[PDB]
Every structure is written in C-alpha cells, then in structure tokens.
Amino acid sequence: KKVLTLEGDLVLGGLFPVHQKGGPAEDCGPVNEHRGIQRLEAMLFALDRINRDPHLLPGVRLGAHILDSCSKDTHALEQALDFVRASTAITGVIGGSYSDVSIQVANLLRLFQIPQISYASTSAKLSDKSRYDYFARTVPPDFFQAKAMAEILRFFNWTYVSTVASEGDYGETGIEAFELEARARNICVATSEKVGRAMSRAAFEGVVRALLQKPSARVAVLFTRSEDARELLAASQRLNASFTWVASDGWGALESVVAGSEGAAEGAITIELASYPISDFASYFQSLDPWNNSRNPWFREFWEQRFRCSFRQRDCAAHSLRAVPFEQESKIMFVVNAVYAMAHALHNMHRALCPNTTRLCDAMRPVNGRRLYKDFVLNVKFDAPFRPADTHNEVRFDRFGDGIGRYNIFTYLRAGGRYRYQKVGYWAEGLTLDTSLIPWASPSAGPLPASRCSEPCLQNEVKSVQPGEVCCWLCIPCQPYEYRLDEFTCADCGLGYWPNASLTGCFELPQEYIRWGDAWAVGPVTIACLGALATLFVLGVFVRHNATPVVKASGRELCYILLGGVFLCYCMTFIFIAKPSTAVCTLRRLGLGTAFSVCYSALLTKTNRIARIRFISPASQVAICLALISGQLLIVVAWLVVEAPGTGKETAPERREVVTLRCNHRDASMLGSLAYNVLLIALCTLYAFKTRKCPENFNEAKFIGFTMYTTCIIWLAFLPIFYVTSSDYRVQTTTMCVSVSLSGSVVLGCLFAPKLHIILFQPQ
Amino acid sequence: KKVLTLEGDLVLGGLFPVHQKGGPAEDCGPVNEHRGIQRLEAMLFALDRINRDPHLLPGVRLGAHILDSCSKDTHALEQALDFVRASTAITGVIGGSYSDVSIQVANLLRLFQIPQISYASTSAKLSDKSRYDYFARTVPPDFFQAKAMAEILRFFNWTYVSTVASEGDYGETGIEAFELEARARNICVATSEKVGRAMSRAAFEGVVRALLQKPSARVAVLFTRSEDARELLAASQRLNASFTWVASDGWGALESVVAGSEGAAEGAITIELASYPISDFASYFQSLDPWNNSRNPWFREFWEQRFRCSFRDCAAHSLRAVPFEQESKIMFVVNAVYAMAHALHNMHRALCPNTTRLCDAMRPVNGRRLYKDFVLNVKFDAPFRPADTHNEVRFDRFGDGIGRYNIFTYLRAGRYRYQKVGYWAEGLTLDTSLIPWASPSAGPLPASRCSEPCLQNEVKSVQPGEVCCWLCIPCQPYEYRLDEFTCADCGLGYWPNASLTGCFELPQEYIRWGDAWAVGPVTIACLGALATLFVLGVFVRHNATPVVKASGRELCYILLGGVFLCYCMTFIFIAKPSTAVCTLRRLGLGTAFSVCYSALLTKTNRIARFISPASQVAICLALISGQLLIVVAWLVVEAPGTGKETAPERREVVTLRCNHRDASMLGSLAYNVLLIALCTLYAFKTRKCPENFNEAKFIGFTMYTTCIIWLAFLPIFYVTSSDYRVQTTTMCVSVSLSGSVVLGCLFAPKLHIILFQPQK
C-alpha cells in the first residue's frame, strides 16, 4: 500500500521484492534483508550519483516511483497499473527480480509502449522479440547455466542423477535445456519432481522420499527458488537424508537458504553470476539510520526485524549498522548498470532530439517509446560505473537485448568452526575448476562420490545391454573355454588351445605324455631290467655248464631262442613307455607280436619234436621255428602296408582335457595278430595233451599248460580294469606292460626252474 | 480492425477466432469458417432469441461488442483493451476458444472486475480460483481426457507409445496428465516430441522421422491444435509413413484436418465432447445471404472464400442447395449466452423489484456481486433441447462442467466419414464391431510392445523399476520355476514336467535282464548247474563202483552241493535288489566259497595223516557254522536296507543299491583267504605218496589254481568299485570260473576212470 515517490522532470519506475510471499491468512509476511532492501538502496544510490553528475543529463533531474512486488505475480500485476494509469507519466521501468513477475509486467507494458530493463530475470522465453518486444536485461539467459552444470557433472563421472525443479517459467525452461544438454553428453536421468506454489512440509518430505526411492542416484540437480531450496534442505535435515547438491542461481550464495540446516548443505556446489563489490555502496549503506532515512517507508520494519527491537519501548536507538558486519549482495552491480543504461539512453535522446537547450524541450515532452527503445536503448555503449581498478568491463545489449555469459562456481565448506562460501573456478567459454579447494575431492578424505547405475564388469565378463536403458548393463560370465574378443560379446577358441591370461588371446597348451622320470614309468622299467638280468643269468648258467648230461638231455638251440624271446618280452615295457616317434610306433606295433610269436613258436617246436620222437635234426628244428616266427611277421608287414604309420592328437566333450599324443588306430592288426598267437597256443596245448606220451628226461608239459592257463587268467583280467578307466591313457598303458611282463616271467620261470633245481641240488 | 456493434441497454463482449493465424508476412490469414462464422452466428441468434422472450429480461435489450482474436494471444489482448477502456460499459465477456487467449484475457480482466464465461476452453490451469477468480466455463477440464485416452490405450493392449504435443498451456498440461495416468496403468512412453508456434515443413518431417526411429511403437498419441495435426498428417503422407492416431478434441471431427490426407488418417480414433444438434440454427444459417446480412462485417470474405467468386457473378450461388454440417460446440455458446442472461435477470429481480426497466441501483453493474452470488448459482433447463433429453446447465465449485465424451473412428465407405463407436462418462464403453480393423476375421490387432511374451520354458528378468520391458531367459533343463521372474531347483531325483511347472520323481534303474553282459553268464551258470546235476546223479547211482569205495567219505557230496549252491548264487546276484535279496547275496557268496574250501580242507586234512566218518563231517559242519555265526553277527550289526543313488553330475540317472558298503564284505573274504592258505599248506605238505589212484597231486593242483583265481580277482574288484555294471559282470564271471575250476580239476579224473575207462 506504500509507494516511494521522488519529484523530478522524468520519473523512472521500479519494482523490487521487499516482502516474502505471505501465507494463506495474510498476503505478505517478512522482509527480504538482502534481495529486497539492498537492491532498492542501490537504485536510490545510482539516482543520487546521477543527479550530481555534470556530464550525464546536466539539466534534467530524474525522479522515481518505486513499488513492491512481494514475490507474487498477481500482486505485482495489480500494482503495475500505476505505471499505465496516467495514459505523472512514466518513461521506463527498471524492475524484475523473478521471471513470472517480469513476464506478466512485460505483457501489460507492451500495450502502452513503455521500455523495461531487468536486472535479475534470466528466463530464456524473454529472448523471443515477437512476444516480448519491449524488454532488455543486463544478465545472460539460462541457456548457458545448463551447459555449465552438464559439464560439471561430466567432469566427475556423474552419469546417474536426479532433477528437482520448481513450477513456472524459470524451473521448467531451465530443466528442459539441462535435459537436452545431458542428452548431448551421454547422461541419464532417473526421476523428476516438481514443487508447487503452495506446498506444505509433508509434500516436501514426500519429495525427499521420492528422491530416496532410487539409491544409485546420489546427485540432485535443482532449478528452484530460494524458499523451495530452503524447505527441501530443512526437510532433508529432518529426515536424516544425505545428498550431494548441485544448484542454480536461485540458491546462489545466500546465507538465508542454509541458515539452521548447515549439516545437510555441506559439500554442495552452486553457480552464481560473475560480479565485483562496489566500495561506495558499503559506506552509503552503513550510514543509514531510521531517524534520517525518512524517504524509505519500509526501513523501520527492516530495522525491527534486523536488530530485534521495537520503537514503542524506545530501545532501538543504541543499535547501529557499523558494528555488525556487512555482506554486499551479488547483483547490486546489475541494478546500477540498468539505471545508468536508461540514463545514458535518455541523454542521447536529449542530445539528438533538441540540441538548442539543456532543459527539456517541447518536442520531447511526451517521450516516444518506440523510437527510444529501438534506436537508443539497444545502441548504448559506455564503461561500467564504479569499475574496480585495473579491470575492464562494458555495458552492451545483444540483438535480443541480453547480456554476456560468465559464471562462478562455489562450494560450501566447513572451516577450521564456521561455514563459508569459496570460489572453485570460473566458467566463461569452458570450465576451469580447481580441485584442490574442494574438501570432498582431495584424496586424503576418500575417493570421489559415485553416481552410476551399474558397476564396470570384469575383464572376464561381457556386457549384454538391457533394452530400454543404456546406462545399466548386466554382467555375464563366459564359458571357461571362451575368450572376450570385444566388450559386448565373447567367443570360444578352436579346440586344442586355451584362453590367455588377459583373456584376449588363444594359446596352444602343453601336450602331455608319460615321461621317463615318472614313478609309473620307473617301476615297470625296473621290473623289466630285473627280468632281463635274470634271463641273462640263466643263459650264462646254461652256457657255462653246457657239457653236463642234464643240459645235453634238452635242446640247446631251443633254449637259446626261448631265452631270447623272454628277453624281448621284457624289453617291450621299455619300448611301450618311450616317447612316440616315427620309429617307436612301429616297434610298439611289431614287438608285442614278435615276442609272442617267438616264445610260442619255440614251445610249439619243442612239443612237436617230443611228440614225433622225421626231420628231428637241430637244423630242421631251427627252420621250423624260424618259419613259425616268419608267419606272424608276414601279417605285420601286411598291416604296415595296409595302414599308415602315424599318430594322432585328440579332444573330448570335456574340452579342458589336454591334447594327448597317441598312436593311430590299432584295432585290426593287434586283434588279428592275436589269432597269429592264440590259435598257435591252442595247437601247443593240444599237442601237450598228446605229449603226455613217451616220457623224456622230463617232458612235463604240465608246466606249459599251467603257464598258458596263468597267462589267460592274467590278461583276461586286464579287460575289466581297462574300460573302468578309459581316461588317462598314461595310466591306461600301465596294464599292458605289467601283463606282458608277467606272461614272460611266467614262461621263463616255468621253463627254467626245474633245470636250475637239478643243476644246483643234485650232481645229475 | 473491424468491430461488430449492436445497441442495447446492456452490452456483452465477445471473442472469436474468425481468422486463421497469418504467417511472418501478415498479421491475419484466411478466414476460419467452422470455429469462426458458425459460432459467431450462433451467438447472434441466441441474442436475438433472448431479445424476444416474455420470461427472460422482458424490459432490457441486450447489446453486443464482438471482436476477433485471429488465433493469437498478443492480438487478442490488444483487441481486448477495448473492454476495459471505459474504466460503453461491458457487462460480461463471452470469451476465448483457445486456452492461451482465455488465460491472457482473464489476467487483464480480473483487475477491473469483469465476469467471463468461456466456451471450448479446456485447460486445467483455469480451475485454480486463487488466480483466475472471475472465470467460468461450460466445458469440463482436460483432467478427464487423459483418463479416457489411457483407458482406450488399455482396452487394446498397447504399451510402447509415443506422444506429440503443442507448445503452450493446453498441450503441455494435457501431456503431463496423460503421462501420469499412463504410468498409473503400466503404459510406457517411447519418445516425446514438441511442436513450436512457428514450424516449417522440414521441422514436421524431422518430427515424423524421429517418431519413425523407434519401430516397436506404431501408435502415436497426439494432444495438439488442429493446424499442427493437419500439417503433421500432410508430412506423414509425403514421407509414406503409417501410424495409428489417437487424438484429443483439438482434432475433434473436423473435415478440414483430413482434407487431402485421407490415406494417412484412415483408422484413427478421436475424442469429442458430447453434444447434440439444434434444428433452428440450421435454417437460420442456411437462410443467410450477403445482401441482407449486413450487420456481420466478415460475411463477404467468407462468401468469397467459400464459393470462389468476386463481387467486382456472385448471386447464382445459394447456401440452401449445399449441405450443412453443424459444428460440435454450438450448444455451449448458446448455453453460455443464456447463462449470462439468466444471471442478469435474477440480479434485476433482486435489486429492482418494482420495475421491469433498469433501476438506479444497478446503473453501473457490480462485477464482483454478479459473479460471486448469481453466475455460480444458475440452474435452468438447457434451451433448444431434444424431445426426450434431460440436459441441465450448472457450474461446480470451480465453475466447470460435467465430463462426458464421445469416441469416433475414421473409415472409408467410396466417400469417407466419421463413425461413433462409444462414449465415456465414468467408465469406458465402446463397440468393436463398428471399427473395421478391430472386427473379427479382419486379422490381428495392431501391436506395440517392448518385448514379446516369454516362452513356456523361459523366465523373464528385468532391472528394478522396469515395469513395461521384460528380458526372457532360459531356465536350466533341470530347474522348476517358482514364478515368472525366478526359476528354481525342483528337487533331487526329480525332473520337471512337460508343462514346466509340475515335477515328477525319476524312475529307478537296475540291470535289464536282456543285456548280453549279464546274459552270457546266466547261460554259463545254467551249463555249470547242468554239469553239477549230472555229476551228482552219476555218483549217486554208482555208489557200488570201486572208485566210490576207494575214497570212503561224504565230503565229496558236500563239496558238490556247495558247487551247485555257488552257481545258484550267481543266478541270484543278477537280480532285482531288495532287503531279502541283499541278505541272500551277502550270505550265499561267503557260504558257497567257505563250503567248497572247507570241503577240500577236510580231504587235505584226512590225507595229511582221530579220523572217523563223523569227525570229518563234524569239522566241516563246525567250519560252516563258524562262517554262519560270523555272517549272522555282521548282518545283525548292519541292518539290511535299500537306497537310491544320485551324484554331482547325475543327469536324469537314478539307481538302486544295497545299503551295505563294499568294504564291509572284506572281512569274510579275509577269513576265506586264511582258509585257503591252510588248505594249500596241507596240500603242499602231502605232495608225495599216491594213497589211492594218485589223489594228492590233483588236490595240490586244485589248491594252486584256486589261489591263482583269488589273487587275480581281488584287485579287479577293488579297481572296479567305481562302475557297477562291470562289477556285477566280473563278480559273476569270477565266481562261476572259481566253481568250474574246482569241479573240472577234481571230479574229472574220477568220472573219467569210472565211466570212460572201467579198469578198477
């Protein structure tokens, strides 16, 4: 209901938010001590400085008609009728501390052609000159704050965040640009909330809970007014929640937002417009008292709110503004600039429109607002008022009547104890953060907070993206034989190889075979050596005593061939344990049959000659034995011609199983040669059953039959053991040896023990 | 720049979109015919009918001051300055069509206390009476169309959808409400697009292409103004793109939107406010011609545009010959005018009781009184109503209407037409028979979803909070799925049913009686049993024969019996296991071996060296009963049971096994081994004299052979403990061979000398 009026030739209107938006019962409550009173005193100070300037409007004195908007658009629009009710007359309006108020006032003012310059309105909608064609401002739009915030988020690897925004033209227009800029930097948003004009504490707690619903998103982005930010921070403190805040210029660097909720706000990052303090305004504002500053109608209420006193008790005289500290507001410069800009415009008009006189002129009595705005408002160019030493600034408007984009970045920190605000880098055309000043980001404290949906998969895991969400992937493990060729897919190697340590490689593994130094090779080798030594000893004994009647009673040539066969029977253990080659496989295929053929042929001839006792000479006997041996050899030669002498490396469903080196298919030759021997054995047994006759010095073929029986029992009992363990061929070939050696040892003991018994125990 | 003025005692304002929005070049474009001239003539007709009624304002003549908004808010406000310049006087303002114009005008009018009633304005923001405290309307808000659309997009199963909006209050608020309602029902928005105030053809084509980038969403939900819809349809026709359109009342049922783009628009579904046609208005409009309708300044431009003629050969045409199609919202305009008239009549009756002409008290009408006590409390029969209807005019606490809607489809008959298929008041009802593609035998319904349904055997896993999309995953071949999200184990020894929800205990397994591995011995055992029966019969018959007389005992008959029992035991090993079968196997094996070796223990003892016909039998029976004692004690200690086996890589493989472990048998075999070491020892000590027919060296040979067999067999058993099939085959073969050795080695010479060569 109050208005500030100062007489002058030309009157400039003003609009400031002196009072905060009251509650339901009352339209307007408490006073704004920083964004209200100080800005108004700045405008008054600029007017006073202009009115004693000889170079700027020497003969024209500027008046003022200042109103209060009370942070509400309807109240501001109701008050704004005073500017247009005259058509005293108002040339232009320096106003706007909010975007809704500015838009509503511009919509009304454009119908009467009244220029308007704003000092704090940063909405992008106002750059459309087809809708708002009477408007200028000294601040940049919100097109660049979204870019700055997106780059700040991208710097710290924050890819999963949450946006809280306010309702109107500042909050939604800013968040749409932030969402576009996030899209252009591969970022992703989880949830979105909005705050209404009328909101209670319970709804704020609901917003906090909705933010807490997603635990992975620990970063909250705010495009909010100061009151909404204060209430949200208070609610978060009450509910004991912890977030890392990134806020717009609504929070700025105000101390009232974080008053009483210091614990919740610590570690936040905020953006503010770049500015400097003015030295004259401090000395001007620190000399004001209610008994001299009569022209301001809202000063006494501010005095009572500030110093907590009352003029009724006559106790407010002691207090003074000098003793208490002074913290100048950020946008004061902008306010001063706006006023000076308008002044300069009018000066140029007065210089061009009528150069004859210095006072006002009959042509310029009713000022034209189209000419003034279109020609002179947008073409102003001067040096900034009260500029700090060694710094250069300038006052200009773009095509859209907007300012220049420069911002400063602040953190809230806990001192060594009171809380203060510090610069952490500029932002002009690209970020320039200095990470040393932020406490939460020096590495002594800990690693930087995290805001990702899903953690990075391991080198052995692969990524399969879930449809509908880029930021979140599910890790998977590859088969143990599989290597990871690319980030989102892995393949398997060709059989015979194994993944590299880095798992981006294929490597041929260790070919495995039985080795000489193994105990499983040592044992059979020792047994074979002992058998060979025993055979040599028996041969040496028979040779040494070759003239005794008992030795002469038996054949000597057949004894020698049988001893040689026994020796070959033993040597095969050693042949069959040797590393496979081009020659060793041939010996493995040959010697088994050769040994059986030699031994069984010797037995056959011995029984044949005893049974017959034609062609009984020691040479007919040698010929028959050699023919019987050569028969088996014929088959081996044929097999060598029929099949291929070679080897093979295999694999099995269990791919881990190493590629063993084995000989080629040996089915037909071995089994057939089996016949070259088992049939011969059967004939020998038959002739032994027929040799029971004509007893010789011995002719106890009861021993040869027993030998054959024991051999059949032996081998025939290896067949169950084999299938039992068809794997581990290295241990598989630890039965063929130990059966062949046993058969040979049975034959040797059977044939030689009675003769040695006679040789030793009796003279005969 | 032109104004329509009619004199009267009281004046009502008006605001209609007579002209379409012009381009960058000019302020005002071509004339708008349906939401223009028709509505303006409806208002004029309502005023003239009110100005000749016995019961409503009999002594006061109402005037009019009607302006043009040209589809722009800035132009509408510049024109609306005329209403407040008096502060002639304006009693009320029958206001905007589009929501932006209404909001802009209301912001200015609330300052001077001038009531306003709108038509066709459906924005939700206007329901907030803290800001627009002088605004009323006869149409419901946009809070219910979102519900209607979300239920049409759920009757048919659509879940990946796209949205297109117009910049401004109407489109943005509507899309926000629709998104909330869709989330509430599990409907998910694929992509979101916006249309600006000034958009070129390339921008519309870009919007179409952006819609065409995600290809599962084939349904587009438009909540936009009519001109944007027309331009988007033209762009879609040019680029040969096909979608299913769901539109709000901005499209409505206008023929202008679908002029020349019939192919792209076919099959669309739109929503319109519920209304009826008035019959007096048709003849009123159809009777107009430019020579007598001189009070309307915009009529000649409409005539020129409509009939394509120039007044500078215009009299040949007539409006009666052409068909007439009434616009949907004529009733609402008539209702608004009548509501204002009734409010003024009631106020006049309250304040000027003794006169019919205006009195001095009402001379400057008080806006705040008329609106707070008379406008919101009107109630009357809706005028020009159908013969059997009950529509009434009233306002709620927010000055709103009742929410009822109709639903239309666009089809080809060869002319095209709109067809009504249902309505929405509080619950959705629609007839799918009238829709061509929704009718049966036409084919499957158009589909739009993130993921197709999972297979029977598969399970879906999704990220948390992902309510629409689903990622299917195959469960393991041996797992029972608890619910769609998570598969689980079914149970050891069980396999999942065919339906993948049931589970069934696997069948057991035991040797099939026809496997050749087991068949081979059943035959060997039969042959051995036949031989034992033969030998027993021959020796039983010829007891008189001297070969029987020479040895003189019955341990031979015992031994034979034992041999027969050993073969019957090898019959009983290859059998279906049970408790009794386990006991029989665990008794008979030891019994048969101990019997045979005890017998030959007797004969070796007897020939080693009081020897009596009963002492030898007593020793044999004592050794047998000793073995029976041991086996019975060990069977009492370990109760016989049956079990089922399973293991780490068992893959549908079940088994039946005896509860007794293999190693527990070992003790009995140890016993028998010692027995053998004794029999052999004695057979070694008596290796010289042939007491009768050389019957000692044959006994020695038999002892050695049995020792060889046991030495060969024992490790094969331990090595083959791993595999059961080979174990049973080897056990059967070894036992059968061990019996055959004793038989053939000992009983062959006696049979040969008795039968083949009788010489005793």
Ligand SMILES: CCCc1cc2c(NCCc3ccc(OCc4nnn[nH]4)cc3)nc(OC)nc2s1
């Ligand atoms: C009563 C009858 C006694 C006889 C037995 C007998 C016999 N038996 C051994 C047969 C056999 C077994 C497994 C093998 O797989 C193992 C392997 N092989 N190469 N690498 N690993 C290979 C061969 N071979 C032959 O000479 C051919 N003569 C005879 S006389």
Ligand SMILES: *[C@@H]1O[C@H](CO)[C@@H](O)[C@H](O)[C@H]1NC(C)=O
């Ligand atoms: C952000 O991510 C990049 C990508 O690896 C990394 O190099 C950079 O260090 C991250 N930022 C910080 C502050 O660690």
Ligand SMILES: *[C@@H]1O[C@H](CO)[C@@H](O)[C@H](O)[C@H]1NC(C)=O
């Ligand atoms: C939509 O899904 C429900 C759920 O199974 C189903 O009952 C209904 O039939 C579906 N709609 C149509 C048109 O089939």
Ligand SMILES: N[C@@H](CCC(=O)O)C(=O)O
């Ligand atoms: N930039 C803020 C104004 C805040 C202030 O007055 O400091 C807005 O446009 O909403």
Ligand SMILES: N[C@@H](CCC(=O)O)C(=O)O
């Ligand atoms: N109901 C639409 C206008 C559509 C019409 O003109 O009928 C709105 O609120 O903007």
